[PDB]
């Protein structure tokens, strides 16, 4: 009967909760001990990416029955510690997909034409039309690794620019991938066909370092890569050397191993487009998330 | 009618198809005015990109110059008055460009929606502000396309796939044909207030110069965003500047300027302006198609 929203979340969350009929507490940038103390009579907790629901927090929260996350994934909640105290963890699987898919297509275009590089150049007062030569997407081959919701939204968009969408996903059948115009192949057959590769998988052991020194070497010379999913699906170290060799012509990253990143080797490279994790950074999405999570809480109050 | 000079960095395949046709060629680069004239003194033809400027003076010092080709669309770097006076032919390559321009345009729109160039310049400076850079979901938003030519319809079919409403205006193409690639046509006065995004794909005309001006900008939605990848001044540079400063315009993307390169560095420098040194036709894919399509035209008239 009492929830706490611990992060900057769309107003409409708190509304639909009270609308449902339970107390709420909008707080922000709270400290670990400040959080626990506030939590000590709250049945629910909703969080964004800021709040980290550690082992310690869950065990200091004697009343905590449920932990909702207004976003995609739960990479900021101890699931081991969660399942131990029989706690529920709630998610917002739909209401974020589109925003992430768009930023991704942004990246691909931005990579093809070096728009961010040209702006930073022009902004410094330089007219370098001698050499900023980019690529026509029409008739090029894009490789999508992770034919989830985001993966298929990215595919249908970049289809319209006349790109070949070949991809790989071990859950989805060739019959269903084909049904949104992505032809499926085994990984070893994908690397050499691609001029562009984007990744849309959760961070798993089966996925970690999916692009590494070894895959990068099987790729077309001057392939270009977009990580808007999770940090490390593309091995950060590995990419760095692929850019330095020219095996990789350029790369776009919305996500890092450390967030925010200490290893500022990549960001700083002249062929790296970067963003401080903006895949869900839209009024449109956070409202749909914030709405879809607050529903799930009220839904189970019957 | 039998010896040509290529004065710019042009795709190798140009010189090939020329000699292939059966006439001498001279691939030179970054030539000086007097260095050019001297080299030209036994060349019937000249092929150029955007770099070389075929001034009044050059044409009149070139007693043998019969023809001037341009590997691109437009010839805003050749004195046409001085050209027609000496009975010289001027050729260009209007086709081999459309797609490259359409893509950069969609680039701009996304880049504007999500501030990708701003985020890179920020990250590149070592900054993580995710609380700051809230952008827009294109899904269900309205794009206004002014100039439903080739480029205009390629831009429309692409941004449709993101789930945008494509309303546009073009006085040449009928509502019946615009509708047939998913652009609903409306009179200009009724377009400004519906748009969250406006791009322009028209030639430079007096009827189109300053198409976006203090007056149109004011009838737009507060925080509209604008893309000029067509010609400098279709969007009044001065007018835009004040629209960004007021917030009537939330941001702008420019591939084209009144002066190229631009002296008035007021716009470029604004924090919500994405800018490019005229890269709409800056793709290996296009310059080859241009370079190929021009060398054809030269050989075609040799028989
Ligand atoms: C488990 N797994 C998946 C996978 O999880 N695929 C499915 C999937 C479902 C939902 C998503 C999410 C989504 O699209 O909503 C998603 C996208 C991007 C980042 N994080 C989450 C992603 C993938 C399709 O049914 C499940 C792809 C995948 C790949 Cl490409 C490899 Cl190589 C290894 C393991 C993999
Ligand atoms: C002459 N004219 C046209 C016009 O020429 N429209 C058509 C057109 C055809 C071809 C183009 C060209 C093209 O799309 O390739 C073009 C685009 C951008 C820059 N330079 C040339 C532009 C427009 C559509 O069928 C012809 C639109 C137009 C408009 Cl919207 C105004 Cl407001 C004033 C005069 C105008």
From Swiss-Prot, chain A:
Catalysed conversion reaction: (2R)-3-phosphoglycerate + NAD(+) = 3-phosphooxypyruvate + NADH + H(+); (R)-2-hydroxyglutarate + NAD(+) = 2-oxoglutarate + NADH + H(+); (S)-malate + NAD(+) = oxaloacetate + NADH + H(+)
Example of a GO MF term: electron transfer activity
Protein name: D-3-phosphoglycerate dehydrogenase
Keyword Acetylation: yes
Organism of origin: Homo sapiens
Gene Ontology annotations of biological process type: brain development; G1 to G0 transition; gamma-aminobutyric acid metabolic process; glial cell development; glutamine metabolic process; glycine metabolic process; L-serine biosynthetic process; neural tube development
Linked residues for Glycyl lysine isopeptide (Lys-Gly) (interchain with G-Cter in SUMO2): 15
Pathological association: Phosphoglycerate dehydrogenase deficiency: An autosomal recessive inborn error of L-serine biosynthesis, clinically characterized by congenital microcephaly, psychomotor retardation, and seizures. Neu-Laxova syndrome 1: A lethal, autosomal recessive multiple malformation syndrome characterized by ichthyosis, marked intrauterine growth restriction, microcephaly, short neck, limb deformities, hypoplastic lungs, edema, and central nervous system anomalies including lissencephaly, cerebellar hypoplasia and/or abnormal/agenesis of the corpus callosum. Abnormal facial features include severe proptosis with ectropion, hypertelorism, micrognathia, flattened nose, and malformed ears.
Similarity comment text for this entry: Belongs to the D-isomer specific 2-hydroxyacid dehydrogenase family.
Positions of crosslink type Glycyl lysine isopeptide (Lys-Gly) (interchain with G-Cter in SUMO1): 15
Protein's gene: PHGDH
Transmembrane parts of this sequence: none
Function of the protein: Catalyzes the reversible oxidation of 3-phospho-D-glycerate to 3-phosphonooxypyruvate, the first step of the phosphorylated L-serine biosynthesis pathway. Also catalyzes the reversible oxidation of 2-hydroxyglutarate to 2-oxoglutarate and the reversible oxidation of (S)-malate to oxaloacetate.
Modified residues (Phosphothreonine): 72
Active site: 230, 259, 277 (proton donor)
Documented EC number(s): 1.1.1.95, 1.1.1.399, 1.1.1.37
N6-acetyllysine modification, residue list: 15, 52
Residues involved in NAD(+) binding: 72, 149-150, 169, 201, 228-230, 254, 277-280
Keywords, sorted A to Z: Acetylation, Amino-acid biosynthesis, Disease variant, Isopeptide bond, NAD, Oxidoreductase, Phosphoprotein, Serine biosynthesis, Ubl conjugation
Enzyme class, first EC level, given as a word: oxidoreductase
Outcome reported for the amino acid change (mutating residue 255 to M): In PHGDHD; results in a four-fold decrease in substrate affinity and a slight increase in maximal enzyme activity with 3-phosphohydroxypyruvate
Gene Ontology, cellular component aspect: cytosol; extracellular exosome
């Amino acid at each position: 009967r009492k929830v706490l929203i611990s992060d900057s979340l769309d107003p409409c969350c708190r509304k639909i909760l009270q609308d449902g009929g339970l107390q709420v507490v909008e707080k922000q940038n709270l400290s670990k001990e400040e959080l626990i103390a506030e939590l000590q009579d709250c049945e629910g907790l909703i969080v964004r990416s800021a709040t980290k629901v550690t082992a310690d927090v869950i065990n200091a929260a004697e009343k905590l029955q449920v932990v909702g996350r207004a976003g995609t994934g739960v990479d900021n909640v101890d699931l081991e510690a969660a399942t131990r105290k029989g706690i529920l963890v709630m998610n917002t699987p739909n209401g974020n997909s589109l925003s992430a898919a768009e930023l991704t297509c942004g990246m691909i275009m931005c990579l093809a034409r070096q728009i961010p590089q040209a702006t930073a150049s022009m902004k410094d007062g330089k007219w370098e039309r001698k050499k900023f030569m980019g690529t026509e997407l029409n008739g090029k081959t894009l490789g999508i690794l992770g034919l989830g919701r985001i993966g298929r939204e990215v595919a249908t968009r970049m289809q319209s620019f006349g790109m070949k969408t070949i991809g790989y996903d071990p859950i989805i059948s060739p019959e269903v991938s084909a049904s949104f115009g992505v032809q499926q192949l085994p990984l070893e057959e994908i690397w050499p066909l691609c001029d562009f590769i984007t990744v849309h998988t959760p961070l798993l052991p089966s996925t970690t370092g999916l692009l590494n020194d070894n895959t990068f070497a099987q790729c077309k010379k001057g392939v270009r890569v977009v990580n808007c999913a999770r940090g490390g699906i593309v091995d950060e170290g590995a990419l760095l050397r692929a850019l330095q060799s020219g095996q990789c012509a350029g790369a776009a990253l919305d996500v890092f191993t450390e967030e925010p990143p200490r290893d500022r080797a990549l960001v700083d490279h002249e062929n790296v487009i970067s963003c401080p994790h903006l895949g869900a950074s839209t009024k449109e999405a956070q409202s749909r998330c914030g709405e879809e999570i607050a529903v799930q809480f009220v839904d189970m109050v019957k």
